[PDB]
């Protein structure tokens, strides 16, 4: 309902659609200065991100969202928190926490910061 | 090593130190435009946020960080992800996930965005 909630919600939706069905198209939502920290490893810069995301051994991965929250920022960006479970091929379901900072740059929404962590938790 | 990590790690240490000794002092790291989402609930501004955290029904609170990640943002903000364990008085230990967005305002690194969730724990 709130404008930042609708945008952030839509972005997350788009991000997981791409990640679970066409991840080599993910780079389209990043920019040169975007950063990715996947399970502790830092991939600063789009090239590194695109490379890392494409090297994931996932043959078939599926994200299931338990909860998501968004907040507008002083500089008009949107920060988001996402929790839920992921299923890669033939299992053991896992929990995950993903953080995103979105910005409108050149009149388009992109993700400048992305942080993902696996978790033995549930929400 | 990177400056955003040094600053972020430092802020994180100070934040949890304040939370675990006298959370009514957290007003110093929040500003009026700050947003807090705690277990899905929203609160805006220093006063409401400090009120919300202070209202937590705990005498003794203890945070233990298992991992923290930090990245710089295009607007010179620092975004962070924190995961660890939370211990409140006699409740069983509970894992937590938190996100912070930091920025230097009026010569001080403050948190404009704070997002927190507890993992439905077992064991």
PDB file of C-alpha atoms in Angstrom:
ATOM      1  CA  UNK A   1       0.000   0.000   0.000  1.00  0.00           C
ATOM      2  CA  UNK A   2       2.656   2.574   0.887  1.00  0.00           C
ATOM      3  CA  UNK A   3       4.560   3.522  -2.277  1.00  0.00           C
ATOM      4  CA  UNK A   4       7.928   2.241  -0.946  1.00  0.00           C
ATOM      5  CA  UNK A   5       6.251  -0.960   0.137  1.00  0.00           C
ATOM      6  CA  UNK A   6       4.769  -1.554  -3.302  1.00  0.00           C
ATOM      7  CA  UNK A   7       8.057  -0.852  -5.061  1.00  0.00           C
ATOM      8  CA  UNK A   8      10.217  -2.919  -2.682  1.00  0.00           C
ATOM      9  CA  UNK A   9       7.694  -5.778  -2.763  1.00  0.00           C
ATOM     10  CA  UNK A  10       7.651  -5.735  -6.560  1.00  0.00           C
ATOM     11  CA  UNK A  11      11.464  -5.662  -6.736  1.00  0.00           C
ATOM     12  CA  UNK A  12      11.836  -8.661  -4.398  1.00  0.00           C
ATOM     13  CA  UNK A  13       9.235 -10.536  -6.447  1.00  0.00           C
ATOM     14  CA  UNK A  14      11.179  -9.765  -9.643  1.00  0.00           C
ATOM     15  CA  UNK A  15      14.524 -10.666  -8.054  1.00  0.00           C
ATOM     16  CA  UNK A  16      13.440 -14.125  -6.918  1.00  0.00           C
ATOM     17  CA  UNK A  17      11.611 -14.809 -10.173  1.00  0.00           C
ATOM     18  CA  UNK A  18      14.880 -14.161 -11.989  1.00  0.00           C
ATOM     19  CA  UNK A  19      17.033 -15.992  -9.461  1.00  0.00           C
ATOM     20  CA  UNK A  20      14.862 -19.124  -9.631  1.00  0.00           C
ATOM     21  CA  UNK A  21      14.192 -19.082 -13.366  1.00  0.00           C
ATOM     22  CA  UNK A  22      16.863 -17.079 -15.209  1.00  0.00           C
ATOM     23  CA  UNK A  23      19.667 -15.923 -12.899  1.00  0.00           C
ATOM     24  CA  UNK A  24      22.049 -14.878 -15.709  1.00  0.00           C
ATOM     25  CA  UNK A  25      19.542 -12.062 -16.230  1.00  0.00           C
ATOM     26  CA  UNK A  26      20.078 -10.830 -12.678  1.00  0.00           C
ATOM     27  CA  UNK A  27      22.862  -8.444 -13.637  1.00  0.00           C
ATOM     28  CA  UNK A  28      20.108  -6.360 -15.219  1.00  0.00           C
ATOM     29  CA  UNK A  29      19.047  -5.245 -11.761  1.00  0.00           C
ATOM     30  CA  UNK A  30      22.539  -4.242 -10.618  1.00  0.00           C
ATOM     31  CA  UNK A  31      24.938  -1.421 -11.557  1.00  0.00           C
ATOM     32  CA  UNK A  32      28.750  -1.074 -11.554  1.00  0.00           C
ATOM     33  CA  UNK A  33      29.057   0.023  -7.936  1.00  0.00           C
ATOM     34  CA  UNK A  34      26.581  -2.569  -6.593  1.00  0.00           C
ATOM     35  CA  UNK A  35      27.857  -4.978  -3.943  1.00  0.00           C
ATOM     36  CA  UNK A  36      27.092  -8.575  -3.056  1.00  0.00           C
ATOM     37  CA  UNK A  37      28.045 -10.478   0.068  1.00  0.00           C
ATOM     38  CA  UNK A  38      27.062 -14.105  -0.376  1.00  0.00           C
ATOM     39  CA  UNK A  39      27.365 -16.173   2.782  1.00  0.00           C
ATOM     40  CA  UNK A  40      30.296 -14.119   4.042  1.00  0.00           C
ATOM     41  CA  UNK A  41      32.151 -13.725   0.764  1.00  0.00           C
ATOM     42  CA  UNK A  42      32.394 -10.200  -0.615  1.00  0.00           C
ATOM     43  CA  UNK A  43      31.880  -9.557  -4.323  1.00  0.00           C
ATOM     44  CA  UNK A  44      32.275  -5.822  -4.860  1.00  0.00           C
ATOM     45  CA  UNK A  45      31.372  -4.551  -8.337  1.00  0.00           C
ATOM     46  CA  UNK A  46      28.892  -5.802 -10.918  1.00  0.00           C
ATOM     47  CA  UNK A  47      31.347  -8.062 -12.777  1.00  0.00           C
ATOM     48  CA  UNK A  48      32.201  -9.999  -9.614  1.00  0.00           C
ATOM     49  CA  UNK A  49      28.511 -10.223  -8.706  1.00  0.00           C
ATOM     50  CA  UNK A  50      27.445 -11.481 -12.123  1.00  0.00           C
ATOM     51  CA  UNK A  51      30.294 -14.000 -12.020  1.00  0.00           C
ATOM     52  CA  UNK A  52      29.488 -15.260  -8.545  1.00  0.00           C
ATOM     53  CA  UNK A  53      25.738 -15.509  -9.136  1.00  0.00           C
ATOM     54  CA  UNK A  54      26.374 -17.499 -12.308  1.00  0.00           C
ATOM     55  CA  UNK A  55      28.817 -19.892 -10.632  1.00  0.00           C
ATOM     56  CA  UNK A  56      26.257 -21.130  -8.107  1.00  0.00           C
ATOM     57  CA  UNK A  57      26.009 -24.959  -8.340  1.00  0.00           C
ATOM     58  CA  UNK A  58      22.206 -24.653  -8.205  1.00  0.00           C
ATOM     59  CA  UNK A  59      20.672 -26.688 -11.022  1.00  0.00           C
ATOM     60  CA  UNK A  60      17.177 -25.920  -9.707  1.00  0.00           C
ATOM     61  CA  UNK A  61      16.657 -23.571  -6.725  1.00  0.00           C
ATOM     62  CA  UNK A  62      13.431 -22.327  -5.196  1.00  0.00           C
ATOM     63  CA  UNK A  63      12.919 -19.466  -2.754  1.00  0.00           C
ATOM     64  CA  UNK A  64       9.880 -19.393  -0.501  1.00  0.00           C
ATOM     65  CA  UNK A  65       9.172 -16.125   1.277  1.00  0.00           C
ATOM     66  CA  UNK A  66       8.019 -16.264   4.884  1.00  0.00           C
ATOM     67  CA  UNK A  67       8.276 -12.531   5.519  1.00  0.00           C
ATOM     68  CA  UNK A  68       9.486  -9.319   3.891  1.00  0.00           C
ATOM     69  CA  UNK A  69       9.679  -5.751   5.162  1.00  0.00           C
ATOM     70  CA  UNK A  70      10.648  -2.452   3.605  1.00  0.00           C
ATOM     71  CA  UNK A  71      11.523   1.084   4.695  1.00  0.00           C
ATOM     72  CA  UNK A  72      12.081   4.326   2.796  1.00  0.00           C
ATOM     73  CA  UNK A  73      15.482   5.957   3.534  1.00  0.00           C
ATOM     74  CA  UNK A  74      16.565   9.591   4.015  1.00  0.00           C
ATOM     75  CA  UNK A  75      18.056   9.607   0.509  1.00  0.00           C
ATOM     76  CA  UNK A  76      14.876   8.111  -1.019  1.00  0.00           C
ATOM     77  CA  UNK A  77      16.237   4.548  -1.271  1.00  0.00           C
ATOM     78  CA  UNK A  78      14.395   1.503  -0.002  1.00  0.00           C
ATOM     79  CA  UNK A  79      16.006  -0.974   2.369  1.00  0.00           C
ATOM     80  CA  UNK A  80      14.483  -4.431   2.604  1.00  0.00           C
ATOM     81  CA  UNK A  81      14.640  -7.513   4.765  1.00  0.00           C
ATOM     82  CA  UNK A  82      13.612 -10.947   3.506  1.00  0.00           C
ATOM     83  CA  UNK A  83      13.335 -14.215   5.456  1.00  0.00           C
ATOM     84  CA  UNK A  84      12.053 -17.638   4.426  1.00  0.00           C
ATOM     85  CA  UNK A  85      13.257 -20.973   3.058  1.00  0.00           C
ATOM     86  CA  UNK A  86      15.110 -22.158  -0.043  1.00  0.00           C
ATOM     87  CA  UNK A  87      15.041 -25.529  -1.769  1.00  0.00           C
ATOM     88  CA  UNK A  88      17.867 -26.405  -4.150  1.00  0.00           C
ATOM     89  CA  UNK A  89      17.100 -29.468  -6.283  1.00  0.00           C
ATOM     90  CA  UNK A  90      16.554 -32.413  -4.036  1.00  0.00           C
ATOM     91  CA  UNK A  91      16.718 -30.785  -0.698  1.00  0.00           C
ATOM     92  CA  UNK A  92      17.020 -30.373   2.900  1.00  0.00           C
ATOM     93  CA  UNK A  93      15.127 -27.151   2.975  1.00  0.00           C
ATOM     94  CA  UNK A  94      17.058 -24.277   4.497  1.00  0.00           C
ATOM     95  CA  UNK A  95      16.352 -20.915   6.007  1.00  0.00           C
ATOM     96  CA  UNK A  96      17.789 -17.668   4.723  1.00  0.00           C
ATOM     97  CA  UNK A  97      18.036 -13.967   5.429  1.00  0.00           C
ATOM     98  CA  UNK A  98      18.516 -11.531   2.543  1.00  0.00           C
ATOM     99  CA  UNK A  99      19.032  -7.783   2.728  1.00  0.00           C
ATOM    100  CA  UNK A 100      18.635  -5.298  -0.139  1.00  0.00           C
ATOM    101  CA  UNK A 101      19.143  -1.562  -0.540  1.00  0.00           C
ATOM    102  CA  UNK A 102      17.375  -0.287  -3.643  1.00  0.00           C
ATOM    103  CA  UNK A 103      17.750   3.000  -5.437  1.00  0.00           C
ATOM    104  CA  UNK A 104      16.265   4.701  -8.482  1.00  0.00           C
ATOM    105  CA  UNK A 105      19.244   5.610 -10.714  1.00  0.00           C
ATOM    106  CA  UNK A 106      18.765   7.002 -14.250  1.00  0.00           C
ATOM    107  CA  UNK A 107      15.049   6.683 -13.569  1.00  0.00           C
ATOM    108  CA  UNK A 108      14.994   2.912 -12.951  1.00  0.00           C
ATOM    109  CA  UNK A 109      15.088   0.832  -9.780  1.00  0.00           C
ATOM    110  CA  UNK A 110      18.300  -1.083  -9.185  1.00  0.00           C
ATOM    111  CA  UNK A 111      19.838  -2.931  -6.269  1.00  0.00           C
ATOM    112  CA  UNK A 112      23.071  -1.361  -5.076  1.00  0.00           C
ATOM    113  CA  UNK A 113      23.568  -3.630  -2.067  1.00  0.00           C
ATOM    114  CA  UNK A 114      22.723  -7.278  -1.619  1.00  0.00           C
ATOM    115  CA  UNK A 115      23.526  -9.521   1.356  1.00  0.00           C
ATOM    116  CA  UNK A 116      22.514 -13.195   1.683  1.00  0.00           C
ATOM    117  CA  UNK A 117      22.934 -15.644   4.585  1.00  0.00           C
ATOM    118  CA  UNK A 118      21.786 -19.224   5.085  1.00  0.00           C
ATOM    119  CA  UNK A 119      20.229 -20.103   8.398  1.00  0.00           C
ATOM    120  CA  UNK A 120      19.364 -23.195  10.372  1.00  0.00           C
ATOM    121  CA  UNK A 121      16.487 -21.129  11.776  1.00  0.00           C
ATOM    122  CA  UNK A 122      12.865 -20.836  10.769  1.00  0.00           C
ATOM    123  CA  UNK A 123      10.541 -17.830  10.948  1.00  0.00           C
TER     124      UNK A 123
ATOM    125  CA  UNK B   1      40.123  -3.584   6.820  1.00  0.00           C
ATOM    126  CA  UNK B   2      37.927  -1.546   4.448  1.00  0.00           C
ATOM    127  CA  UNK B   3      36.772   1.731   5.989  1.00  0.00           C
ATOM    128  CA  UNK B   4      33.039   0.873   5.750  1.00  0.00           C
ATOM    129  CA  UNK B   5      33.697  -2.381   7.612  1.00  0.00           C
ATOM    130  CA  UNK B   6      35.795  -0.637  10.327  1.00  0.00           C
ATOM    131  CA  UNK B   7      33.125   2.039  10.853  1.00  0.00           C
ATOM    132  CA  UNK B   8      30.232  -0.407  10.597  1.00  0.00           C
ATOM    133  CA  UNK B   9      31.784  -2.962  12.970  1.00  0.00           C
ATOM    134  CA  UNK B  10      32.476  -0.142  15.405  1.00  0.00           C
ATOM    135  CA  UNK B  11      28.895   1.189  15.240  1.00  0.00           C
ATOM    136  CA  UNK B  12      27.572  -2.339  15.725  1.00  0.00           C
ATOM    137  CA  UNK B  13      29.740  -2.788  18.850  1.00  0.00           C
ATOM    138  CA  UNK B  14      28.571   0.519  20.320  1.00  0.00           C
ATOM    139  CA  UNK B  15      24.922  -0.234  19.481  1.00  0.00           C
ATOM    140  CA  UNK B  16      24.794  -3.614  21.194  1.00  0.00           C
ATOM    141  CA  UNK B  17      26.812  -2.257  24.121  1.00  0.00           C
ATOM    142  CA  UNK B  18      24.149   0.425  24.678  1.00  0.00           C
ATOM    143  CA  UNK B  19      21.273  -2.022  24.131  1.00  0.00           C
ATOM    144  CA  UNK B  20      22.718  -4.461  26.685  1.00  0.00           C
ATOM    145  CA  UNK B  21      23.427  -1.983  29.489  1.00  0.00           C
ATOM    146  CA  UNK B  22      21.014   0.960  29.264  1.00  0.00           C
ATOM    147  CA  UNK B  23      18.879   0.871  26.112  1.00  0.00           C
ATOM    148  CA  UNK B  24      17.378   4.234  27.059  1.00  0.00           C
ATOM    149  CA  UNK B  25      20.697   5.711  25.828  1.00  0.00           C
ATOM    150  CA  UNK B  26      20.109   4.539  22.234  1.00  0.00           C
ATOM    151  CA  UNK B  27      18.584   7.911  21.427  1.00  0.00           C
ATOM    152  CA  UNK B  28      22.100   9.090  20.621  1.00  0.00           C
ATOM    153  CA  UNK B  29      22.400   6.795  17.576  1.00  0.00           C
ATOM    154  CA  UNK B  30      18.978   7.536  16.075  1.00  0.00           C
ATOM    155  CA  UNK B  31      17.555  10.693  14.494  1.00  0.00           C
ATOM    156  CA  UNK B  32      14.022  11.901  13.851  1.00  0.00           C
ATOM    157  CA  UNK B  33      13.885  10.449  10.359  1.00  0.00           C
ATOM    158  CA  UNK B  34      14.972   7.033  11.639  1.00  0.00           C
ATOM    159  CA  UNK B  35      12.804   3.990  10.979  1.00  0.00           C
ATOM    160  CA  UNK B  36      12.558   0.814  13.067  1.00  0.00           C
ATOM    161  CA  UNK B  37      10.774  -2.401  12.073  1.00  0.00           C
ATOM    162  CA  UNK B  38      10.798  -4.867  15.017  1.00  0.00           C
ATOM    163  CA  UNK B  39       9.060  -8.238  14.455  1.00  0.00           C
ATOM    164  CA  UNK B  40       7.016  -6.688  11.647  1.00  0.00           C
ATOM    165  CA  UNK B  41       5.993  -3.581  13.598  1.00  0.00           C
ATOM    166  CA  UNK B  42       6.850  -0.037  12.473  1.00  0.00           C
ATOM    167  CA  UNK B  43       8.116   2.917  14.480  1.00  0.00           C
ATOM    168  CA  UNK B  44       9.461   6.210  13.211  1.00  0.00           C
ATOM    169  CA  UNK B  45      11.678   8.741  14.947  1.00  0.00           C
ATOM    170  CA  UNK B  46      14.114   8.737  17.844  1.00  0.00           C
ATOM    171  CA  UNK B  47      11.503   9.074  20.591  1.00  0.00           C
ATOM    172  CA  UNK B  48       9.136   6.308  19.438  1.00  0.00           C
ATOM    173  CA  UNK B  49      12.025   3.969  18.676  1.00  0.00           C
ATOM    174  CA  UNK B  50      13.715   4.492  22.034  1.00  0.00           C
ATOM    175  CA  UNK B  51      10.264   4.109  23.624  1.00  0.00           C
ATOM    176  CA  UNK B  52       9.673   0.821  21.825  1.00  0.00           C
ATOM    177  CA  UNK B  53      13.071  -0.670  22.734  1.00  0.00           C
ATOM    178  CA  UNK B  54      12.829   0.612  26.308  1.00  0.00           C
ATOM    179  CA  UNK B  55       9.384  -0.991  26.662  1.00  0.00           C
ATOM    180  CA  UNK B  56      10.854  -4.455  26.058  1.00  0.00           C
ATOM    181  CA  UNK B  57       9.962  -6.431  29.229  1.00  0.00           C
ATOM    182  CA  UNK B  58      13.495  -7.456  30.057  1.00  0.00           C
ATOM    183  CA  UNK B  59      15.821  -6.659  32.942  1.00  0.00           C
ATOM    184  CA  UNK B  60      19.026  -8.254  31.620  1.00  0.00           C
ATOM    185  CA  UNK B  61      19.586  -8.389  27.835  1.00  0.00           C
ATOM    186  CA  UNK B  62      22.696  -9.863  26.179  1.00  0.00           C
ATOM    187  CA  UNK B  63      23.546  -9.884  22.474  1.00  0.00           C
ATOM    188  CA  UNK B  64      26.209 -12.243  21.075  1.00  0.00           C
ATOM    189  CA  UNK B  65      27.212 -11.650  17.441  1.00  0.00           C
ATOM    190  CA  UNK B  66      27.969 -14.739  15.349  1.00  0.00           C
ATOM    191  CA  UNK B  67      28.544 -12.730  12.146  1.00  0.00           C
ATOM    192  CA  UNK B  68      28.497  -9.236  10.713  1.00  0.00           C
ATOM    193  CA  UNK B  69      28.881  -7.932   7.169  1.00  0.00           C
ATOM    194  CA  UNK B  70      29.252  -4.367   5.914  1.00  0.00           C
ATOM    195  CA  UNK B  71      29.184  -2.646   2.522  1.00  0.00           C
ATOM    196  CA  UNK B  72      29.487   0.954   1.338  1.00  0.00           C
ATOM    197  CA  UNK B  73      26.554   2.497  -0.542  1.00  0.00           C
ATOM    198  CA  UNK B  74      26.604   5.010  -3.440  1.00  0.00           C
ATOM    199  CA  UNK B  75      25.410   7.831  -1.140  1.00  0.00           C
ATOM    200  CA  UNK B  76      28.297   7.176   1.260  1.00  0.00           C
ATOM    201  CA  UNK B  77      26.061   5.310   3.683  1.00  0.00           C
ATOM    202  CA  UNK B  78      27.128   1.991   5.162  1.00  0.00           C
ATOM    203  CA  UNK B  79      24.730  -0.935   5.124  1.00  0.00           C
ATOM    204  CA  UNK B  80      25.156  -3.802   7.581  1.00  0.00           C
ATOM    205  CA  UNK B  81      23.853  -7.282   8.312  1.00  0.00           C
ATOM    206  CA  UNK B  82      24.081  -8.870  11.744  1.00  0.00           C
ATOM    207  CA  UNK B  83      23.204 -12.370  12.891  1.00  0.00           C
ATOM    208  CA  UNK B  84      23.684 -13.832  16.351  1.00  0.00           C
ATOM    209  CA  UNK B  85      22.072 -14.936  19.600  1.00  0.00           C
ATOM    210  CA  UNK B  86      19.885 -12.949  22.017  1.00  0.00           C
ATOM    211  CA  UNK B  87      19.530 -13.712  25.727  1.00  0.00           C
ATOM    212  CA  UNK B  88      16.879 -11.948  27.823  1.00  0.00           C
ATOM    213  CA  UNK B  89      16.735 -12.716  31.550  1.00  0.00           C
ATOM    214  CA  UNK B  90      15.436 -16.261  31.837  1.00  0.00           C
ATOM    215  CA  UNK B  91      13.954 -16.808  28.380  1.00  0.00           C
ATOM    216  CA  UNK B  92      15.531 -19.536  26.325  1.00  0.00           C
ATOM    217  CA  UNK B  93      18.255 -18.155  24.014  1.00  0.00           C
ATOM    218  CA  UNK B  94      16.918 -16.851  20.673  1.00  0.00           C
ATOM    219  CA  UNK B  95      18.671 -16.239  17.370  1.00  0.00           C
ATOM    220  CA  UNK B  96      18.171 -12.870  15.679  1.00  0.00           C
ATOM    221  CA  UNK B  97      18.690 -11.128  12.360  1.00  0.00           C
ATOM    222  CA  UNK B  98      19.248  -7.410  12.095  1.00  0.00           C
ATOM    223  CA  UNK B  99      19.960  -4.876   9.381  1.00  0.00           C
ATOM    224  CA  UNK B 100      21.292  -1.343   9.865  1.00  0.00           C
ATOM    225  CA  UNK B 101      21.791   1.501   7.445  1.00  0.00           C
ATOM    226  CA  UNK B 102      24.288   4.098   8.669  1.00  0.00           C
ATOM    227  CA  UNK B 103      25.138   7.616   7.494  1.00  0.00           C
ATOM    228  CA  UNK B 104      27.243  10.515   8.752  1.00  0.00           C
ATOM    229  CA  UNK B 105      24.909  13.356   9.756  1.00  0.00           C
ATOM    230  CA  UNK B 106      25.942  16.537  11.562  1.00  0.00           C
ATOM    231  CA  UNK B 107      29.349  14.929  12.192  1.00  0.00           C
ATOM    232  CA  UNK B 108      28.061  11.645  13.614  1.00  0.00           C
ATOM    233  CA  UNK B 109      27.372   8.168  12.290  1.00  0.00           C
ATOM    234  CA  UNK B 110      23.718   7.491  13.011  1.00  0.00           C
ATOM    235  CA  UNK B 111      21.318   4.716  12.101  1.00  0.00           C
ATOM    236  CA  UNK B 112      18.568   5.848   9.743  1.00  0.00           C
ATOM    237  CA  UNK B 113      17.222   2.331   9.210  1.00  0.00           C
ATOM    238  CA  UNK B 114      17.002  -0.555  11.657  1.00  0.00           C
ATOM    239  CA  UNK B 115      15.309  -3.886  10.916  1.00  0.00           C
ATOM    240  CA  UNK B 116      15.027  -6.744  13.451  1.00  0.00           C
ATOM    241  CA  UNK B 117      13.502 -10.268  13.555  1.00  0.00           C
ATOM    242  CA  UNK B 118      13.711 -13.291  15.819  1.00  0.00           C
ATOM    243  CA  UNK B 119      14.056 -16.826  14.505  1.00  0.00           C
ATOM    244  CA  UNK B 120      11.329 -19.140  15.815  1.00  0.00           C
ATOM    245  CA  UNK B 121      13.773 -21.180  17.922  1.00  0.00           C
ATOM    246  CA  UNK B 122      13.900 -24.873  18.842  1.00  0.00           C
ATOM    247  CA  UNK B 123      16.378 -26.837  20.979  1.00  0.00           C
TER     248      UNK B 123
END
